[PDB]
Design a protein around this ligand. Structure first.
Ligand SMILES: [Mg+2]
Lengths: 238, 239, 198, 247, 241, 240, 198, 198, 198
């Protein structure tokens, strides 16, 4: 209860905050290419009265940085905005476009500050940033509400975390490298959908999903149509 | 219903009341006036005496060449008031030439004690005080008492602090309302014996400070105060 | 987890508002059966109040009443235990939220609970109706007041019926009301459609 | 329950929250540091959440100045941001006034000054981290310092904070003399750190750096006499495991 | 009205909040200061011990406040440093303004006034420190002053604060001739200090000292915060192994 | 569970649920995205014969191209509209080009957002429907107390939302190519009547507005007058 | 500390959800054994309600029922004490946090607790079923109402069976539900994965 | 003050975790002694349930059981009183802080406390086992149900053993767990190393 | 007021820590007297457990024990009432402040209080030890179980001694600790040196 230390120093509002990130109910996964990066998220559209265009958990922050978030849409659109502008203000104030790993710092920084000074309740969302910067290439860093980020060679956010995970882990103990060997994104994409389908004991149509790709400085969201064609691709080859 | 900035059913602000309970906890002061003087008496909590006699503090404090004051309650507090008063004492004289009226002074002081009873997030001064002196180019002795709440009042002679109730009684049937103690000498004689109730022997626990007009002022020495204990125990034995 | 839900399922599946609706409806008209068990004991106190003295031997019409009453307590208690069963099966996962619905459930249980308790301080009075008389009919060898105490132990027990009946009607009716109002909350205590935030 | 929770005096004198902060400390990761006559060493375990996180992107021993580095045990995030401001204050309140960088003692105090603020004030919970700052400066020589969320700080010879402190502090206590050279320490550190592990013990899973000597290489420039190089040295994954040989 | 908040007043005019802090002192190392008709002495026993702690290129009990004034701490480490700092500043403004050395009485006062400040407003807690002030000014000569968190200050002949300062206190009341030259005091210091210890015996390492003295050969005042050595030695002089 | 900022043991903000709970309790509002432009309608409830008809408008325009309506707490609605009004007009002064409906929502979503962050403030007690046109077509969204909103083919809140919902459902399939600008109105006129059957003992007054490059001409106009009448009668026949 | 954990270990290791699953499952179908112990006592009150007077000598079919009932109380109580054992072994270190899980455990224990109490106000009624009749069968020398009180002490005790049985079913079912919902919290009351903050 | 601490000292010095470790350990394997006291009374209810009538004279095998059980209650209670002793000696100076440790102590005491109470509602049933039979074996001059009540007062008391034993195991095990977790808090309830602030 | 203080004075003046120190000290070694009263009753249960049947006539060694025990309860209770006296004399002026010290006093009184209660549920068992036997030794005209009940009423009462003794040791020890820690607070509950503010 409230934002100041427990008897075992663990102020739960931060802890509670987490369940809510998860609670949304969507699964987000991400992996590195070789000259590209990719994230998978599900696109469950219940109400037959909405419009799938307006739905999404992935947005174009920068010309090259995209973001996915397993978390409640209102709080996300916020984080989206601030971040979206921090980079905007950055390029201006410093001469060069802001990289993945950094945004995630002021971002975690920000969520830490809130938390400690009490100027608002933490947002209940986990942000997963992606891109490729010409200093560390395929970059992937994640941030949580307890104001904190780190690095992933490929990650996942969702109700079923460790499952999506373990698969990749096993696929990694064998592929032995710390990323996905392959030149084309289409091909990598195929790979992830693959590793997710296998991971849910579930199948997806051409609208049941949501995916994004980070290239050599030209990040773009995968749309309804192009999305299906990868299912075509990965049907026989399986 | 006690954490005041709110009202009791019967319309009380119990905090402000309790604060007064501390003035009683503290030491004791008493003032008296004549038709030429105003004496201020006080006691001395001579309790853990292994401390330099010299520089350690004493109740009566001059606020301006012609005015002084005393208190009882929290020393910790009292000091801060005295300072802020002394300051206003000059700020006046500066912006008005004319040196302060004792009535005005008190009103200022009481205004401060009064300020610390309105905004939430502040606590009242645990100090009640006696202020005496003679107005500029004036020969009418003035005595006022101010207390924690913010009330100021003029008295012919009054006392505050622990066992004030007692000595008050005493004073009541000694001080003649019709005519005030004429001579200075005896005006002192009075106050001194009035404190002898609580003192418990020794002019070593009795402070006297005397104030006349035309900014004269003068604290008392130990023997001087003693020569009175003497000339009083004498007439007590003579009764 | 597959098998686990099946049990909680087939259980809630064999009792429901569908079931409870019939107790409320059943114990609705059935009050007549009580509005009757009343008037019977009444007509009877007059004969005892005035049917001067005797030489003993167990009254047949009196046991006809206690048998009819003890008979009713039985029905009701079983019928209540059925409503009780329908609710205990809907008590959600214990936690510190959405406890608005849960609260209703409990409150209603406490009232039902009371009903059952009421049917047990007198739902045995037959084996007790003739329990003080074997002590009373004995001492067959005479206080002329002891003869009168037998006149009373008959009328006293007829009063207890009329009275228990009177209160009982009230209790039932209260319960009818109470259910009819809440109920939906009783079966659906948590909603959970609030995922319009995530 | 008590008169704990809030920033105010418990009946005796014990300040509330503060102690529960020093709890997130004791619960946190194990970390140590040794001052050693010609060098100083600071280290901490790098317990990885999972093997899918390339932990190689998160410093625990961090650079405060080219003569001072520090480390922690407790709330990860608190340390991350605490550091950055800490670096600035070492500039704005020193280098920009004097032209050079600050001695250990003072930078610590300056950090403590910030550690302070978070306390004396309602509406702000203190930091859940204790820092081990090690450094040097031309006049006081080598230094070792601990900094609790309570603001306060002490000068050490060597010590540990975190899960395995009761123990480590005892092991260290035995193995200390005033003539030990750095490599002695470095060695000694590992052997303490040894016990305090549950996971692995290879390179990438141990964070350690030390304050040693000038690195005329690292600068990037050459031509100025007095400007010779940082002493702060974060040993990398390689240099380590090799020292695992002489146990 | 019970415990909580400083802005609260108990039904009997007590400020508990204060009274706790004003007592919290009884947890700090025993510090002592003594007056002599030729010099002032500040003695102090260290705390926080172990075996892995330096103290030479530092201190935390005896702080030099002015070339003419010194103080002995006994409270919250964190607190002290804050006051100690603003106490130094203000002292310098006095110098920068009047171009003269700031009088001890005055200095003590201003500090007692800040401590008092925090004693009356909501949103802040009082400082949990106690100080033994020792210094000289040509106005009233040598002076030994003290102050608690209640914001009250006091002139003393010779005082102690912190731990067992009731026991330690009385020991003083015995031996003390007003003139008592400094060495007898420095000596007395330890005598009083030893007697009140949980350590098997008095070891130099766990101890802090300093003195103030002035004369005709100096013409001015000189004060010395004693370094690790001098101590390990004078200790022997008072007959200690 | 009692403060606005706080979270429940498993991440939940109750004050917002109740916010929602009050949104439902009020009148019912709807809106429909058609060929080009949109159509809105609300439910003014005549509680007495002492109410001047054609008067207390619940629908409001923004700029000169955005329709807008809601339900729940009426003053909350009004308030929210103002902020939306500034934001719009400020933007307009800045970029010259009338404000894109897509972003507009956020500007508002972001403002409704905040009132879920601090405890000293009260959550917005209204669900809001709106839309308008631009260059790349007409749009329509619906904002809730949580601040979460989206784009719908038609929306509904307040008392009986399902009535209009399943009602909106049909239209989709039989006219999977957007309903006629004209028919849109008269159809809305009906969908309301059907959903009113709760306040049935109490009469009412229906209000309608719309947007369309062909009909309104890019603008937002109040459906009042002749088209207004027949649109009612149209509803009045199917009302059997 | 090495040896200390081993005990807490080998203990929790010999009882688990694996064990409890069988009580829920076992006491699932086993209700039939009660839905039976019911219908038996019913058929029997009719013979007592109508099997006019006699000259005494202990009814064999009645003890056949109390033996079958007292027999069931026994089973259940042992079976409950096993579930109770599984939980008490999982009560974490006492403190003032994470008490969400702990709370569940307690609540469930209080309900189980109740069940056990219920099986003990009647799980002795055999040694009591024939406990009032030695007093009732004596006074063999005649109240014509005392003869009828024997007719009653037979039927009254048959009613108590039917009734205890009715309530009992409910209690059980309630417990089934209650477990099936929480359980995971019962075995895993603290998580502790929250170290994603350090 | 010199002498005062010496007492508090030499007292805590003659009892400790060292001592208690043996009760947990001792009452660990010793449960077999109870898992036994169980199976014995069971085998015995079958002979009473079926060993048709008689002419009386005190059963030797039955007292063999109550003597063995009353025997066990004794041990346990003494063994508990020892653990109890170890804690009461560690209750710190009473005040309003650091009460986290103290709390644990109390909670555990309440559970131990319970254990002792359990061993006393039946830890006397031998002097009571043969306490209802002198009343039952008398009235030697015949209810044919009174003969059967003697068959029951033998089996009933054999059931109470089996049951008390079943519950008891549980209580013990609970206690073992409870101690093994906390304990360190029980002996060291205040730390006080927090002087890192002064 | 002059006279008034004199009374409160001369009263506190005739009892003090000086007095209480001797009870803690007195009841320190005196536990031996209990560690003995223990071993005595034990050796005695074996002779009763095995000293097969008899023809009655009051056991001399048994009364030797109860006399020795009832003897001890007496001592202790008087000794406690003295510590109690010492405290009640120090309960300060009732008000709503400084109640930290006062609180201690109360808590300690409640524990002492308990001790005295404990010495009174058994500190009479002699006049009760032979109180059930006059009823037991009568009915001198024979249940062969009644003979055995006399064997038990002897052994049962020997167990109560051993057990009361075991618990008692504990209570005492607890009290010793409790006093030794607080005490100074018990006599000096208010300080009042806080006038450093005025
Ligand atoms: Mg807030």
């Amino acid at each position: 209860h409230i934002t100041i230390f427990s008897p075992e120093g663990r102020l739960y509002q931060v802890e509670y905050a987490f369940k809510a990130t998860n609670q949304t109910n969507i699964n987000s996964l991400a992996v590195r290419g070789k000259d590209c990066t990719v994230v998978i998220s599900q696109k469950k559209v219940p109400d037959k009265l909405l419009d799938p265009t307006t739905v999404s958990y992935i947005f174009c922050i920068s010309r090259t940085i995209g973001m996915v978030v397993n978390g409640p849409i209102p709080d996300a659109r916020n984080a989206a905005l601030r971040a979206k502008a921090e980079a905007a203000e950055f390029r201006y104030k410093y001469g060069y476009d802001m990289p993945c790993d950094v945004l995630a710092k002021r971002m975690a920084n920000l969520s830490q500050i809130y938390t400690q000074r009490a100027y608002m309740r933490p947002l209940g969302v986990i942000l997963t940033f992606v891109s490729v910067d010409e200093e560390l290439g395929p970059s992937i860093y994640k941030t949580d509400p307890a104001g904190y980020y780190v690095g992933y060679k490929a990650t996942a956010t969702g109700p079923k975390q460790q499952e999506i995970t373990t698969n990749l882990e096993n696929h990694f103990k064998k592929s032995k490298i710390d990323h996905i060997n392959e030149e084309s994104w289409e091909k990598v994409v195929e790979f992830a959908i693959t590793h997710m389908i296998d991971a849910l004991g579930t199948e997806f149509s051409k609208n049941d999903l949501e995916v994004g790709v980070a290239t050599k400085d030209k990040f773009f969201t995968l749309s309804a149509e192009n999305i299906e064609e990868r299912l075509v691709a990965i049907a026989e080859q399986d | 219903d006690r954490a005041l900035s709110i009202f009791s059913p019967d319309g009380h602000i119990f905090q402000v009341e309790y604060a007064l309970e501390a003035v009683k906890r503290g030491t004791c002061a008493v003032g008296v006036k004549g038709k030429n003087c105003v004496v201020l008496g006080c006691e001395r909590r001579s309790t853990l005496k292994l401390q330099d006699t010299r520089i350690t503090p004493s109740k009566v404090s001059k606020i301006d060449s012609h005015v002084v004051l005393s208190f009882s309650g929290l020393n910790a507090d009292s000091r801060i008031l005295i300072e802020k008063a002394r300051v206003e004492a000059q700020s006046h004289r500066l912006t008005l030439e004319d040196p302060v009226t004792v009535e005005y002074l008190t009103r200022y002081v009481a205004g401060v004690q009064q300020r610390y009873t309105q905004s939430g997030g502040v606590r009242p001064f645990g100090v009640s005080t006696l202020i005496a002196g003679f107005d500029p180019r004036d020969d009418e002795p003035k005595l006022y008492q101010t207390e924690p709440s913010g009330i100021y009042s003029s008295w012919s002679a009054q006392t505050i602090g622990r066992n004030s109730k007692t000595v008050r009684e005493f004073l009541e049937k000694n001080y003649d309302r019709k005519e005030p103690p004429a001579t200075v000498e005896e005006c002192v004689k009075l106050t001194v014996r009035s404190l002898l109730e609580v003192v418990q022997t020794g002019a070593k626990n009795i402070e006297i400070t005397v104030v006349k007009p035309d900014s004269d002022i003068v604290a008392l020495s130990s023997e001087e105060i003693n020569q009175y204990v003497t000339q009083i125990e004498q007439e007590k034995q003579e009764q | 987890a597959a098998l686990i839900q099946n049990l909680r399922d087939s259980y809630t599946e064999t009792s429901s508002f569908a079931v409870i609706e019939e107790w409320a409806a059943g114990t609705l008209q059935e009050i007549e059966g009580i509005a009757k068990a009343a008037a019977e004991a009444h007509g009877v106190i007059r004969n005892s109040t005035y049917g001067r003295a005797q030489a003993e031997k167990s009254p047949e019409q009196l046991l006809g009443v206690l048998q009819r009453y003890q008979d009713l307590c039985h029905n009701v208690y079983c019928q209540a235990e059925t409503i009780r069963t329908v609710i205990a099966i809907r008590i959600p996962e214990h936690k510190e939220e959405d406890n608005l619905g849960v609260a209703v459930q409990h409150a209603v249980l406490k009232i039902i609970d009371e009903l059952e308790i009421k049917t047990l301080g007198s739902g045995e009075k037959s084996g007790s109706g003739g329990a003080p008389t074997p002590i009373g009919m004995y001492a067959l060898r005479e206080s002329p007041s002891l003869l009168l105490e037998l006149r009373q132990i008959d009328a006293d027990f007829m009063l207890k019926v009329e009275l228990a009946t009177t209160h009982l009607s009230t209790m039932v009716r209260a319960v009818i009301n109470a259910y009819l109002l809440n109920w939906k909350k009783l079966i659906q205590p948590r909603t959970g459609t609030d995922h319009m935030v995530s | 329950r008590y008169s704990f929770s809030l920033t105010t005096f418990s009946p005796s004198g014990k300040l509330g929250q503060i102690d529960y902060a020093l709890t997130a400390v004791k619960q946190g990761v194990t970390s140590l540091g040794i001052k050693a006559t010609n060098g100083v060493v600071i280290a901490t375990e790098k317990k990885s959440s999972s093997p899918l996180a390339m932990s190689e992107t998160l410093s625990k021993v961090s650079l405060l100045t080219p003569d001072i580095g520090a480390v922690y045990s407790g709330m990860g995030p608190d340390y991350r941001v605490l550091v950055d401001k800490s670096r600035k204050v070492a500039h704005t309140s020193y280098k920009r006034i004097y032209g050079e960088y600050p001695p250990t003692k003072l930078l610590v105090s300056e950090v403590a000054k910030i550690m302070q603020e978070a306390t004396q004030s309602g509406g702000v919970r203190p930091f859940g981290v204790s820092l081990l700052i090690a450094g040097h400066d031309e006049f006081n020589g080598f230094s070792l310092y601990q900094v609790d969320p309570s603001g306060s700080y002490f000068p050490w010879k060597a010590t540990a904070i975190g899960k395995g402190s009761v123990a480590a502090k005892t092991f260290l206590e035995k193995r200390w003399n005033d003539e030990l050279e750095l490599e002695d320490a470095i060695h000694i550190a590992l052997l303490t750190l040894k016990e305090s592990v549950e996971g692995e013990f290879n390179g990438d899973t141990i964070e350690l750096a030390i304050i040693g000597d000038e690195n005329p290489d690292l600068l990037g420039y050459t031509g100025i006499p007095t400007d010779k190089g940082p002493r702060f040295r974060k040993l990398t994954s390689q240099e380590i495991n090799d020292r695992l040989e002489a146990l | 009205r019970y415990d909580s908040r400083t802005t609260i007043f108990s039904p009997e005019g007590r400020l508990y909040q204060v009274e706790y802090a004003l007592e919290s002192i009884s947890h700090a190392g025993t510090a002592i200061g003594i007056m002599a008709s030729d010099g002032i002495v500040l003695a102090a026993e260290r705390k926080v011990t172990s075996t892995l702690l330096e103290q030479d290129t530092s201190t935390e009990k005896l702080y030099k406040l002015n070339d003419k004034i010194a103080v002995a701490v006994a409270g919250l480490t964190a607190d002290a440093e804050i006051l100690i700092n603003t106490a130094r500043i203000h002292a310098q403004n006095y110098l920068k303004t009047y171009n003269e050395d700031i009088p001890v009485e005055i200095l003590v006062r201003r500090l007692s006034d800040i401590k008092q400040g925090y004693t009356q407003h909501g949103g802040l807690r009082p400082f949990g420190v106690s100080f033994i002030y020792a210094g000289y000014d040509d106005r009233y000569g040598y002076q030994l002053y003290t102050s608690n968190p209640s914001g009250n200050y006091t002139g003393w002949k010779a005082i102690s604060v912190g731990a067992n300062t009731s026991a330690a206190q009385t020991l003083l009341q015995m031996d003390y001739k007003d003139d008592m030259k400094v060495d007898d005091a420095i000596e007395l210091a330890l005598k009083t200090l030893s007697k009140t210890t949980d350590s098997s015996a008095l070891t130099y390492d766990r101890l802090e000292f300093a003195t103030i003295r002035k004369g005709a050969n100096d013409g001015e005042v000189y004060q010395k915060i004693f370094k690790p050595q001098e101590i390990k030695d004078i200790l022997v002089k008072t007959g200690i192994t | 569970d009692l403060s606005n900022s706080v979270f429940s043991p498993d991440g939940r903000n109750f004050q917002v649920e109740y916010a929602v709970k009050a949104v439902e309790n009020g009148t019912t509002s709807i809106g429909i995205k058609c060929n080009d432009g949109v159509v809105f309608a609300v439910e003014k409830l005549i509680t007495s014969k002492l109410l001047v008809p054609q008067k207390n408008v619940k629908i409001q325009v923004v700029d000169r191209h955005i329709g807008c309506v809601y339900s729940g707490l009426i003053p909350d609605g009004r308030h929210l509209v103002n902020r939306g009004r500034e934001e719009a007009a400020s933007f307009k002064k800045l970029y010259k080009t009338p404000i894109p409906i897509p972003a507009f929502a956020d500007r508002l979503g972001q403002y409704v957002q905040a009132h879920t962050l601090y405890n000293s403030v009260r959550p917005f007690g209204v669900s809001t429907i709106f839309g308008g046109v631009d260059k790349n077509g007409a749009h329509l969204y619906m904002l809730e107390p949580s601040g979460s909103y989206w784009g719908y083919k038609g929306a509904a809140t307040g008392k009986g939302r399902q009535s209009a919902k399943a009602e909106l459902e049909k239209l989709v399939d039989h006219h999977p190519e957007g309903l006629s600008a004209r028919e849109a109105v008269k159809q809305a006129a009906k969908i309301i009547y059907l959903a009113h059957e709760d306040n049935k003992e109490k009469d009412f007054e229906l209000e309608i507005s719309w947007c369309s490059l062909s009909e309104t001409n890019g603008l937002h106009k109040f459906v009042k007058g002749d088209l207004l009448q027949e649109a009612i009668d149209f509803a009045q026949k199917e009302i059997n």
